[PDB]
Each structure stands twice: as C-alpha cells, then as structure tokens.
Symmetry: D2
Amino acid sequence: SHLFDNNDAWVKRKLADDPQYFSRLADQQAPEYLWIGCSDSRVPANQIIGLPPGEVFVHRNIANVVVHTDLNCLSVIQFAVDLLKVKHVMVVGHYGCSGVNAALHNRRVGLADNWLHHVQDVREKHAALLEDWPLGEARYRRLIELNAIEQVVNVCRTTIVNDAWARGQPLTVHALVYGVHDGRMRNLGMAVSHAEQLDATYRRAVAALS
Amino acid sequence: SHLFDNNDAWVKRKLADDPQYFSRLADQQAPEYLWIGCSDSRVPANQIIGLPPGEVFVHRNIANVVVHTDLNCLSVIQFAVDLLKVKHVMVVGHYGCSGVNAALHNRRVGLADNWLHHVQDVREKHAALLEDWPLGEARYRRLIELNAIEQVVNVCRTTIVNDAWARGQPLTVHALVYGVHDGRMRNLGMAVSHAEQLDATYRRAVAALS
Amino acid sequence: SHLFDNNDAWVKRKLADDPQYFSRLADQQAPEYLWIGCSDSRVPANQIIGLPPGEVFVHRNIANVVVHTDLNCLSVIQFAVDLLKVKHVMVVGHYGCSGVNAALHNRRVGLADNWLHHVQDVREKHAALLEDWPLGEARYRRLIELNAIEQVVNVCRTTIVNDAWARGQPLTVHALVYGVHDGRMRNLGMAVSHAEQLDATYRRAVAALS
Amino acid sequence: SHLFDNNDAWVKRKLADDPQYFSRLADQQAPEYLWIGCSDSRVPANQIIGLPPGEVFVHRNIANVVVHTDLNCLSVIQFAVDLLKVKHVMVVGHYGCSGVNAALHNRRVGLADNWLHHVQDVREKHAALLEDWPLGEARYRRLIELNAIEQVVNVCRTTIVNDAWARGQPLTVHALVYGVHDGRMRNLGMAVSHAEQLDATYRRAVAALS
Ligand SMILES: [Zn+2]
Ligand SMILES: [Zn+2]
Ligand SMILES: [Zn+2]
Ligand SMILES: [Zn+2]
C-alpha cells in the first residue's frame, strides 16, 4: 500500500470520534486568526492555543520568515486579511528551530541556505545586541525571538496591511514565540494595530538589552 | 492583554498533560514525512494521519500549490529532503478548499487571485475532463483532486527531487486528498519513486474519465 | 583596475557624443512601452525598434518568462502600468534563445532548470501542435513563438492588468518575437486590449497549425 | 497595425546596417559579463560600456534589487555564472532612479511598494550614514550608491556564487553606478573575488562617511 500504515492510523482516528461532530468542523465559520510558523511543525497552531482546528488559518515556511516580496506568504495574508477578515495576524517562532540553529551556526545546507540569509539578516541588524549574551543557548533563544519581531515588522510594512488599516479594518499583528520544551508561550510585548510602529517595537527589542 | 484569552486557553492546555512528556516531543528525532497542504488548516497533518506532532514536517500555502519557482516551498523541500532525509513527500488537497472554490468560481479576491491562476491553470489543462461532470460538487471535488496531482507533477519536476533520485536517495511523492466532511483520506493511486512519471500519473488522472 | 578596459571604452563612448544632449535623455518624459525580454540581451529593446533609450521601460529574465506569482516581474508591471501609465506592454521572445534551446533539449543546467519548467510547461500544453513540425529548427522557432504568447496570456491574467482595464486605462499587450539572425521583428497577430482574450489568441496560436 | 510605427522604425534600422554583419552578432560566442540593472533602462548595458550587444548578459528589475530568494534573478545568475562561465557579475544603480526616489520619498505606489521595501531596508541599515548628508540630491545619490553595494552583498551571499568560488571558478562581483546626467560611470571600490567580504565592503561603505 506504500502508506497502508497511515490510512490504518487514520480509520483508527476517525473511529476514536464517536461524538458525531466532523459535521461541527465542516460548519465552523471563518477563522479570526492568521498564524505564520516554522515548517518544524512541532505542535499545531490551534492545539497549542487550545482552539478547534480551522479556527486558525495557517502558513508554514522554514523559520516563519515573511519576505517583503514572497508572494507564497503575502497571498496567504491578502486572503486571510482581505477575505476572511481575521482580527489578529501573528508570526510565531519556536525555541530549538532547525532553520535558526542552521543559520545561526552558519551551517551550509544547500538551497534553503538562501532563504535563511533572511534570518542571517536579523543576526546582522542586531549583531551588537546578540554579543552581550556571549553564550549559545542565550543567543539562540534571543535570535529566534528577534526573528519573530522583524518578521512582524515585515508584515506591517506589507501594502496589504497598511491598506487594511487605511480602509479602517480593525487588525493587530503579534510577535510571539513558544517553547517545544515547556509548551508555555511567551508574549514579546509586540502587537501592532495602527502604524505607530517605530514606538511599539523599540519597546519589544529593548526587552533584551543585556 | 489583547489575547489574554489565548495565553489562558494555553496554561489550560499545558496542565491537561500531566504525562510529563513535552520532554518526549523535544527528544523526537527527524521527521520522515513532508506534508504540503492548504492554509485552510482544517485539521493538522499529524492528527489526521494519527502521528505525534513534528513526526510530520509541514508547509501550508493557499491551495497547497507548488510553483516551479516558489522558493518559499522549494526551500521547505530542499530542507526536508536533503537535510531531514524524509522517506515520503505528499501534497494534500482538502474537499471544500476556499482557494479552489474561489478560483473554480472565477471569484475576484485581490492579490491571491494571482496565486490561484496556478489552480485556474489546472482547470485549463483538464478543461475537457472537467466538462463530463456537468455539475458543481462533482467538478469541485474532481478539480481539488487533480490539483493535488499536478502539484506532485511540479514537485517531481523540481531539480531537488531529480537530484535526490540521481544520487540514489530513496524517496516517493504522493498525490493525496482528505475530506473535512468525513475525515476519511483518499489515496489517488499517485505515488512516484523514480522518474517513471508519465506512466504513474496518466493512471491517476484516467481514474476520473467520466 | 580590474575593469580599467571598460571605464576606458566608456570615456571613449562619452567623447563620441559631442552633440551636447545627455541633457536631452535626462529630460526624456515617461516611457510609453514596457518590454519583457530574455536576459540573452542580444539587442537592446529601443535600438531594435529604433527609439531613444529609456523611451522603453525594460525587464529581462531567462526566456522572457512571466510567472503568475513572480513579484520580480509583476512589480516591474504594476510600476510601468499603474505609475508610468505606459500605453502598450509587450513580451518579446528571440530566435536562438539559450533558455528555450536548453529546455526544449531537456538539458540539465542546475537551478535555472526550475525556472525553465515554465517553458517546458508551454512545450507540454502545445505538445500536439509541436509534433507536426517533426524537425528541430522548425519546432525551436515555433516553441519560442508560442512562449511569447502564453507569457502574454500570463500578463493579461495578472490582477494588475484586469484592474487597469476595469478602471478604464487604455492598454494593450503584444506577443512579439525577433530574429538575432535578420534583425526583422515578427508580429504574431497577438495584441490584447480588453479581456476578449480566448478569441484574440486562438487566432495567434492557429497561425501555426501544420 | 497598432504599432505600424515601430515595425516601420525597424525596417528603417535594419537598412541602416549595410555592413552585412547581423551574421557577426549571431556568431558572437558566450558573454563574459552579467549586468543587473534598473528597469529604468535609461541606457543599454553594452552601449554605456562600449561593447557589442550580447557581449553583456542582462537582468533588469525595479531598482536593480537582488533578493536572497528572488528566483527570477538567481535563475539569471545560476545560468550566467554556472553555464556561460562569465568572468564578472556587476549590480549597476543609476542616478535619478525612479524606484529609489519613490522609496526614499516614502511615496505610496501600489504593489512595487512591496519590492521597494528592499530599498527602504538599505535606507534603514545606513540611516545614520544618510543623516550627515542633511539634503536631498546628496542623500538620493548616496542611497542609490549604497543600494548597488548591499545588492552585491546579496549576490555574494547567494549559494550559487559561494559554490562557484568553492569549486575554484574565477569570478568577481562589482558594486557600480552610472549617471544618466553625464554618462560617466563611477567605480565604488566594491569588487569581490573570494569571501574576504567584510573587508572589501567596509572600505566601499566608509568612502561616504560625512
Ligand atoms: Zn522551526
Ligand atoms: Zn484549502
Ligand atoms: Zn533568450
Ligand atoms: Zn532606476
């Protein structure tokens, strides 16, 4: 069957839900959240945050990177924002992220190296900041955290968002991170709602300042 | 708190797992599966297929589209393939997918319209096929199904994959679909392992042929 | 100097223009043409068409490919269209194009292979057509010609364009090709102005029909 | 004819070359230069530098931007480098570039705005530097100049290039700029050949330092 195993672990699943409710999911209304995360899908957005599936609309690229010009992601955002009128977008880094570890420790990898230059660009812009944590684990954490913020800086700079605020659509964009280790999910005091941007982030970034 | 609610529904979650095992996830080894899916993350890859989280490495774009040139996805694939040496890649469409419905019913949407031209391109190439299902629900289904295959045709045409076969890395790429309605997950008889491509797909596509 | 030679062949150039007129170019008004062409910049857009430089606003990618989702090109088009209100956009293939020859003769090349899958996709969709020219030179030509058209089909499907027609901006998009061999530049009877698309192209494509 | 005018200004051109030599261009060997430039194709790469056409292989995007992940450009570079074994790649900004002026003077434009965030990112990283030129013309110039360098920093960070040096292919990448005003073409003392990168650029950047 090639994946006999999986279709098996599946009819197994479908059984486990006697609560005749797949009907309930298929009747679930719009999502009110966009979650951008790492392909290292350690834990599913909803599950973490304790929501029903699909209550969260979801993108996943290596290292939850938002490129100014990556139409893969922007398409996901124009859709979620303009058409599902979600209330909150949120970039979510995760501690122990392979993308960030591979880039931090300038490890050659092949093609994705090119995408991770986007994360190495954050290492650059906060080089100074990252020194006064002379370690590994300390930096690593601080890097994946600052990743999640400069990603939000990227969202909020997208035309889509500016245009959505411009036309008076209520919306807010969070820099957020969660530990596969403890489950526990860190607010970064990064959550933008109009373009009072410079202010709301300096804050978030200063809450490293060794 | 802005999302007080969510951090609440979270410490709630973390409690629910007394089985002191977050340790078990943080110790989880490489994934052996890449799952490309719709941002319409109705259900999390693992959960469906009944696996632990992170056992499945995951990308999500609107309409589980693989572009020949979308480095957002390719980066995800070079990584998963070349570096996590996953055994199986699988594109997974889902019935009732908003991306496919929006494109099928040539609905103006804004920017994502441009990304969905990739799905309208599948509507074109199988125009003939899609007629002899003169309906809606019948087509819609048949379209999202054929989406998942021509996406696999796109993966298998990527340099990454050809190069991985070329250097004798065992790997296989499945066209797959699942119903939010029933949970049940359809094999499409689309699962490629060397470039005997033309053969293995004609098959899969012919299993529509009204 | 590393390129001493070039800065030399340059002060040489600047001399050659006594007609104190660089002033004339720096005072040149908006372009009224967008020209998408092959990086194989055999001949500069303007020169061919006998215009002053900059009278033509210009993009160049391998094989004058327009991707539905390539923001490199779309950015160039939104700019040229929306902001320089150019009257005519035109995709221009060229005979003996390395991109098309490399893809036609399924030659492994490395990364660009992935971009040329876009040209191999045109080879696919007109496979039938391309057979009844059982040769090489005949096909090759016919392929690079059909490239230039399905590229125009891609432009005209872009939101940018539809939106520009929608808001009553006069604009028209030509499928065009030129021979490095003879200089002479072929009209393809492919030049769209509203979305009477299906009509205006069938035409252009039928003018192969061996 | 729609463009009767252009096909006219063309048979006009082809005449003007009695020197029966289109044959000479069609027999022209590989290019030894890649030139990345602004779509604002004020002047054709070759012409400036006083070379025959096609002696220069050419990309053009708004503001001669190199994205880490823009496969439109990277494809052009892998091709030029790996397959035409060009000796020198060179990013070329131009004074009075619309892309840079539009972004510098944070002018809303539509979609290209998103691509120009790449140029606004250079404005950010050298914010300090750009202040001590309290003007307009002075900054503008200094910005388009620094654009051309951080673009080269982007090329040289591409896998393609590192891999080409790694396998002992002789190659060198110049930050370069030219004035539509005077024709004259500025060396920036930015021309990298191995990854002694940090050194060779600090230099180039310091030659602003008001
Ligand atoms: Zn990760
Ligand atoms: Zn979907
Ligand atoms: Zn060409
Ligand atoms: Zn320019």
